[PDB]
Amino acid sequence: AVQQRRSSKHRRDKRRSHDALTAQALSVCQKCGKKKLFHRVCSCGMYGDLRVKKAY
Amino acid sequence: TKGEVRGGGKKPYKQKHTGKARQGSTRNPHFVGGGIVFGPKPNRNYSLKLNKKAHTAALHTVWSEKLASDNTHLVDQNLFNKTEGKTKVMMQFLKSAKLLDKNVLFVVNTLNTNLEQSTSNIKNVQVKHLDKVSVRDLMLANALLVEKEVLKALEGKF
Amino acid sequence: MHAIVVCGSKQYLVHENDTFFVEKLEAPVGKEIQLDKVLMLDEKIGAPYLEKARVVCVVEKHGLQRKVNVIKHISQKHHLKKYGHRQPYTKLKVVRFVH
């Protein structure tokens, strides 16, 4: 469907206002020097302290 | 004008099924493509009729103003000589005659070469002959050095 | 204590130590004017108009009213007549009294 008139910028910004993005959850990774996002693996490839997979 | 510009007369749009203006031409004077019918027209006369009686009356009045202006002191034929084209001595003369800022006009009927080689380097001075002097040129100067032979001829001319 | 004066067609209740604007009454700046078309100064009133009652006032400036832009128009009929309005007035204040 098509509106008979152009949409006001105020509904543009007000409707887009719901698109605010939440922040990421983080953790504390001690042996690897990383501030790792929660319940994931760190840049060292250690998830909960295990060198499960090689760094490179 | 419309037909003076190059371009084939045809409708780029179909007359129906188009929401824009009619636009029944590729080029249209409301475009930038041309077709202007209101511009410079090279057909005017650039002339206006003026009778000789009124013109002669205007000349009589302007020469009356000149003689009454009093800043029309007389000169002689012999004084037009004594120089080849040396304006510097003539410049000293004219500043000694308190003319530097206002235009200076010379009247002549003998066409002396000494004056014409001079007074032809500065916009503040120019010579002109009685047959070719016009009312504007007379009042363009406000400062004239008049010769002695124009007097009787001008009086007899009326 | 106070007075009521009539300037133009408007009444003004003025006490002491009060400054105010009124209509232009052809008064030079810094001069003293006795005002007579007054009413109800202090237990003093006359029936049609108050008699033998005045009030001193001192003018301090002449001014012009705020320039309003009166653009009176008839729409769809091309009427668009425009004018700018400033109205003269005098700012003045009373001094002590006079009766």
């Binding site: - | 009042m139 363009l140 406000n142 | 091309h78 668009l80």
Partner: protein, 49 residues
Amino acid sequence: LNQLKSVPKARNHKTKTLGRGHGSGLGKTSGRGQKGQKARKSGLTRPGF
């Protein structure tokens, strides 16, 4: 009366331009009503009509 001062004696009378201006007439109707045949280009039919 010089080039620095030139004023005529009662000339430059009332002119009329019908293409511009709207606060003093001479706009779209241009002082000749509306919907006349003469409003179309090249009106003013032959005087013998």
